[PDB]
Amino acid sequence: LPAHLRLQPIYWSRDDVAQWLKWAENEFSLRPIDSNTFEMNGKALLELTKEDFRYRSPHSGDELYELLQHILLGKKLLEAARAGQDDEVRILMANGADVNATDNDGYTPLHLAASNGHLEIVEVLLKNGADVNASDLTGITPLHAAAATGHLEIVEVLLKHGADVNAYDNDGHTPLHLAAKYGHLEIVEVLLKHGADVNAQDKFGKTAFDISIDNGNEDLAEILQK
Ligand SMILES: [Cl-]
Ligand SMILES: [Cl-]
Ligand SMILES: [Cl-]
Ligand SMILES: [Cl-]
Ligand SMILES: [K+]
């Protein structure tokens, strides 16, 4: 994955800017432009106006400018969701921020609010079209994240909004496996009531029951047996 897709633009080097232009030409089917159309770094790109972009690229400048704004607003929303800043989330969405923006790990605002326990933000994102089943780079969904971190009310809201109870990540772990690993008995019970496959096996040959034993969560193993 190229640097410019892994960094916020304020950190892009001069070379990153050139690579971004070439990436955008292909991603957005734009008229080709010379790699030196913007002889500057990312911090400099952020100083230019839309009119400056249009001057430098008559065919694509407006698009390029708006792609950068999309990244900036997306990052503010990710950070506001992570930090539980309900008011900032509200302002950013009213300002058009992408509710399905992703960070360097594939985490969306919904992933971050779910992982950090911010129930009101989870609810507002879902009401406004956040993808309840978005999968990060390793296959983790918002439901995995809420289950692993012990946020029962969020688990319930995600399930009510259509979260896949049996989604599996790159290691074959379902939300049930993660709840078992971290000892979250009440979450295990909710997942089971919503159709979690108690017999799902991870890439290491283990079920949730095995994981619960391995982690000393004997109360969970009890619930899983019966
Ligand atoms: Cl700006
Ligand atoms: Cl955005
Ligand atoms: Cl399985
Ligand atoms: Cl599975
Ligand atoms: K994602």
UniProtKB/Swiss-Prot annotation:
Belongs to the ETS family. It is linked to A chromosomal aberration involving ETV6 is found in a form of chronic myelomonocytic leukemia (CMML). Translocation t(5;12)(q33;p13) with PDGFRB. It is characterized by abnormal clonal myeloid proliferation and by progression to acute myelogenous leukemia (AML). Chromosomal aberrations involving ETV6 are found in acute myeloid leukemia (AML). Translocation t(12;22)(p13;q11) with MN1. Translocation t(4;12)(q12;p13) with CHIC2. Residues 1-72 form the PNT domain. Transcriptional repressor; binds to the DNA sequence 5'-CCGGAAGT-3'. Plays a role in hematopoiesis and malignant transformation. This is Transcription factor ETV6. Ubiquitous. The chain holds residues 50 to 121 of 452 of the full protein. The record marks L5, R6 as: Breakpoint for translocation to form ETV6-MDS2 in MDS. It is found in: Nucleus. The record marks R6, L7 as: Breakpoint for translocation to form PAX5-ETV6. Can form homodimers or heterodimers with TEL2 or FLI1. Interacts with L3MBTL1 and HDAC9.
